[PDB]
Amino acid sequence: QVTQSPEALRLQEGESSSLNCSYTVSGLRGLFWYRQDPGKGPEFLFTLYSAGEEKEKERLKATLTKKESFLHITAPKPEDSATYLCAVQDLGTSGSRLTFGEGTQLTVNPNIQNPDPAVYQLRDSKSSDKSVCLFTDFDSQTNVSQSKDSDVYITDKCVLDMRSMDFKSNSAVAWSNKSDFACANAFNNSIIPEDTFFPS
Amino acid sequence: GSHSMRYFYTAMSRPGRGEPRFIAVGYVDDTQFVRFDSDAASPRTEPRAPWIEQEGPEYWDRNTQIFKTNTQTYRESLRNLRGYYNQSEAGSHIIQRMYGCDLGPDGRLLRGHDQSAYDGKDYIALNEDLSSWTAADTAAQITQRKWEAARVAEQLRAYLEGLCVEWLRRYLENGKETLQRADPPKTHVTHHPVSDHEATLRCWALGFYPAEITLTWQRDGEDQTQDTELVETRPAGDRTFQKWAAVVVPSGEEQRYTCHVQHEGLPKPLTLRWEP
Amino acid sequence: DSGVTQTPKHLITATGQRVTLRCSPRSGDLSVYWYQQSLDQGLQFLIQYYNGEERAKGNILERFSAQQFPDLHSELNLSSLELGDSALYFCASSARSGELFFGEGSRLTVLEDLKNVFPPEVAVFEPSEAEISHTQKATLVCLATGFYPDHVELSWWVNGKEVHSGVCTDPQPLKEQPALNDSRYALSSRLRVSATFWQNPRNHFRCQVQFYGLSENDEWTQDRAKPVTQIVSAEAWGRAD
Amino acid sequence: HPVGEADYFEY
Amino acid sequence: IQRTPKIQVYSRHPAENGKSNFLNCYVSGFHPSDIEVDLLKNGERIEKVEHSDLSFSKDWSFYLLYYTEFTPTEKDEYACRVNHVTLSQPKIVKWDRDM
Numbered sequence A: 001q002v003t004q005s006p007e008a009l010r011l012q013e014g015e016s017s018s019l020n021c022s023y024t025v026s027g028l029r030g031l032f033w034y035r036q037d038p039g040k041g042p043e044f045l046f047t048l049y050s051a052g053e054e055k056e057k058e059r060l061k062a063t064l065t066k067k068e069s070f071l072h073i074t075a076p077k078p079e080d081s082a083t084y085l086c087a088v089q090d091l092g093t094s095g096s097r098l099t100f101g102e103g104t105q106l107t108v109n110p111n112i113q114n115p116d117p118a119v120y121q122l123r124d125s126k127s128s129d130k131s132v133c134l135f136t137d138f139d140s141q142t143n144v145s146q147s148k149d150s151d152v153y154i155t156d157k158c159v160l161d162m163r164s165m166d167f168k169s170n171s172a173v174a175w176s177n178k179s180d181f182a183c184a185n186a187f188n189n190s191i192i193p194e195d196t197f198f199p200s
Numbered sequence B: 001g002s003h004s005m006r007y008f009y010t011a012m013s014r015p016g017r018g019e020p021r022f023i024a025v026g027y028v029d030d031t032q033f034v035r036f037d038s039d040a041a042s043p044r045t046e047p048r049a050p051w052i053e054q055e056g057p058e059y060w061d062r063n064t065q066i067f068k069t070n071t072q073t074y075r076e077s078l079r080n081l082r083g084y085y086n087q088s089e090a091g092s093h094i095i096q097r098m099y100g101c102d103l104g105p106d107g108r109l110l111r112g113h114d115q116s117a118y119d120g121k122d123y124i125a126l127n128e129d130l131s132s133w134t135a136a137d138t139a140a141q142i143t144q145r146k147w148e149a150a151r152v153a154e155q156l157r158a159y160l161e162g163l164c165v166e167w168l169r170r171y172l173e174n175g176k177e178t179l180q181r182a183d184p185p186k187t188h189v190t191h192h193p194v195s196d197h198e199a200t201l202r203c204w205a206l207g208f209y210p211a212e213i214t215l216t217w218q219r220d221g222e223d224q225t226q227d228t229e230l231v232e233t234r235p236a237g238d239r240t241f242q243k244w245a246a247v248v249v250p251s252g253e254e255q256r257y258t259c260h261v262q263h264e265g266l267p268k269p270l271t272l273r274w275e276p
Numbered sequence C: 001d002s003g004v005t006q007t008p009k010h011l012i013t014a015t016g017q018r019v020t021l022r023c024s025p026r027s028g029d030l031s032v033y034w035y036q037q038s039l040d041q042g043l044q045f046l047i048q049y050y051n052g053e054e055r056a057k058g059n060i061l062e063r064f065s066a067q068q069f070p071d072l073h074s075e076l077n078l079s080s081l082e083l084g085d086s087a088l089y090f091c092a093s094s095a096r097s098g099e100l101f102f103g104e105g106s107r108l109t110v111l112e113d114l115k116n117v118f119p120p121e122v123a124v125f126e127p128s129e130a131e132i133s134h135t136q137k138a139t140l141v142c143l144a145t146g147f148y149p150d151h152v153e154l155s156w157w158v159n160g161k162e163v164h165s166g167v168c169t170d171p172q173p174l175k176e177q178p179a180l181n182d183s184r185y186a187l188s189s190r191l192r193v194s195a196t197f198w199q200n201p202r203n204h205f206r207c208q209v210q211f212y213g214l215s216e217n218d219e220w221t222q223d224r225a226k227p228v229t230q231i232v233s234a235e236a237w238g239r240a241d
Numbered sequence D: 001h002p003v004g005e006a007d008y009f010e011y
Numbered sequence E: 001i002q003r004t005p006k007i008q009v010y011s012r013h014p015a016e017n018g019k020s021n022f023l024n025c026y027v028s029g030f031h032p033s034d035i036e037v038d039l040l041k042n043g044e045r046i047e048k049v050e051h052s053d054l055s056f057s058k059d060w061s062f063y064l065l066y067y068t069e070f071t072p073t074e075k076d077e078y079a080c081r082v083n084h085v086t087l088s089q090p091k092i093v094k095w096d097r098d099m
Helices: B057-084 B138-149 B152-174 C129-135
Strands: A002-005 A008-012 A017-023 A028-036 A043-048 A054-057 A060-064 A068-073 A082-090 A104-109 A118-124 A131-136 A152-154 A158-162 A167-176 B003-012 B021-028 B031-037 B094-103 B109-118 B121-126 B133-135 B186-192 B199-208 B214-219 B228-230 B241-249 B257-262 B270-272 C005-007 C010-014 C019-024 C031-038 C043-050 C053-057 C064-068 C074-078 C087-094 C100-102 C106-111 C121-126 C137-147 C152-158 C161-163 C167-169 C185-194 C204-211 C230-237 E006-011 E021-030 E036-041 E062-070 E078-083 E091-094
Touching (some): A002 A082, A008 A017, A017 A028, A028 A060, A028 A068, A028 B152, A043 A054, A068 A082, A118 C121, A118 C129, A118 C137, A167 C185, B003 B152, B021 B057, B021 B152, B031 B057, B057 B094, B057 B138, B057 C053, B094 B152, B109 B152, B186 B257, B186 B270, B199 B214, B214 B228, B241 B257, C005 C087, C010 C019, C031 C074, C043 C064, C074 C087, C121 C230, C137 C204, C137 C230, C152 C185, C185 C204, E006 E091, E021 E036
Parallel strands (some): C010 C106
Antiparallel strands (some): A002 A017, A017 A068, A028 A082, A054 A060, A060 A068, A131 A167, A152 A167, A158 A167, B003 B021, B003 B094, B021 B031, B094 B109, B109 B121, B121 B133, B199 B241, B214 B257, B257 B270, C005 C019, C019 C074, C031 C043, C064 C074, C121 C137, C137 C185, C152 C204, C204 C230, E006 E021, E036 E078
8 A cells, every 4th residue: 555665765965866656546645745854753754635736845856647746855964864754645534544654764874074093992991990992083985894703892883963063973882802802803894995094 | 417415414402401313315416315313322424325335344334434433523513603692501403514616517616615504594604615614694703713713615625626536526427327317207298278468378397407497488589487387396206307488468369479498418409389 | 843742752671561652742743653663674654643643554463553642742652552553653643735744753572571671881981092193183982882672872072061073873782692693793983183182181972872771661580780771882082192 | 427525525 | 404305105106905005205496315214004104115225316306215015005105204404394205196
């Protein structure tokens, strides 16, 4: 009754794309788009009722045929990353229940302005003497790989935004209970930039 | 030929305060094809014409779920109405609703309908534009504002120009052998000597389908619908219709009256005289 | 955002138990719709109420029940819980114009038993002197470890007030023992400030981790403190050298 | 086929 | 408020003595909906009577057909007996064949 595609969307920042929603009903009462952020309830975006109708707000524009709805997303930004839900009400059913598609899970890969890839060692504030390694400031291209060593923990990449200075930053974290653990080698599994800085 | 589909609802409260009764019947032209009656342990929509029997169980359940839900909601609507008119719980009242679609010769939607009455009189009706309401009084104006807040007109328009015409076209194909057949009337004239120097001539039309017909009496060319007894088109029972029309003539002899009959089944209008 | 109020936000329970979820519709709405969102599947309609009566349903299980009270608030009861009942449960109220407005959800996790539930330890790791010298920036890392199940909310508090700018926490926590089905979790977050801001001894940095755990409506028969819902934190003051 | 009434369709 | 029923009594086919037919009583144009309709044979009520399901017209008034099998003769008289809240007494209208 409602099928969304693709189920996962992987876009570069600035790369426009359109999300598809196909629907079958006896008669369309309304087609709906919702945004859902991880851990939150669906948030209302648009409702469309008739073929040819369109609604636009910021970078999103929803359109409707008799067979499908598209959510076009123009020049997306990292903050647009979320699940986009399509849902339909039917004129052959009573009340206002929605039947949902399975969502398109969008992630927007941020552009990185001046990459300065480096690996740094952080000290526990308590001591402790526990320690952590930070791979930071790499470009939108590099991917941080998992270790097969179950005593080394390595997070996925994560972009932080210092909105004050229009400054974006990638980083991954690695740590170990193993003492002999060294940051020079923490991210060894990964293809790392040849220009990566290793302070000493 | 042109065709229509209508659903007829009655929600009637019981005199006292028992559960109100909700009934829905569905027509293509004058042919009943579904019926739902809420007064039953387990009410289901039922077929009433052979050509609707072919619809699978999901069609029946969608109907039944719409009607069961209307059974509940129209009960509140009844409570709403007697509040607007300051009426008590004793006394039976009724909401009647008709809605549906007219198609023309082409198979395309001519007009849509949604009209409501309370206690037998016009209460609220969807205008021809399918986007505004005609409200009878200040109470209907309360219903109008509720229905404007709920976009009822918009959704009825979508149904009427969509689902309605589509399904009507489907039923018109499935039952084409009977719904798309036009049977001409069998016509004759009866003489009734009232004796007075006066007599009644009665022009008969039997076995026609569909129900729409025109019988008029003519005095040497001129229509005289005044002084003409025109009886109501009546079901013959076997899915044909009957009608007649009578005039009081000054017969002695005085035979300058002709009966004129128009019906779809007929190639050209008929003109008939009494043949003694 | 949005008007619809759902409690509890998080629930951890055992197989065979029963739970109640609560929903208040937006003020002015008269309907409650209940939806289930299972791991890997889309939202599914369970059941609708309108002005206190059952309206429509719903592929709702016979062991699930719900009601709408004269108050318009609604409760969804889930009996005889199985592991497969673990899911987000959403309610929505409908507007007169036809839009559904959704709550924030109740996340239910059902567990074989509760012995394996553990709150997090959190530690904050001070910024690299080498990062400070290289970038004129300073990144604190927070590490939340050894928690089970994954019901955590990590926040950064700078000088007593929550911040979102200059932070990113891992979308997904890591399994500490990835081959183990009931593996405890680890989560990491970074807060990045300017070197000068960090270098100010008066500035205060706190990593807060809200754990959603046990409910008092569930027993504890082991020595360590019952792993109840609780906030775990670690903090640091800014540093000159 | 009849029309379904949405919520708040009461008179 | 209330509308009195319009009653027609007629056969399905042209009455021909000794030939099976259907006796109709069309009740129309009434309101409210509760109505009692009987067919009579020589003053006495006929028992095996069917009817179509009640419906209403474009003017909101109710209508329906009562019908049964009958074989007309020269002697036998039929009529339709109608009861409705708008009528102080049962309304009886005879079957005029040469109508």
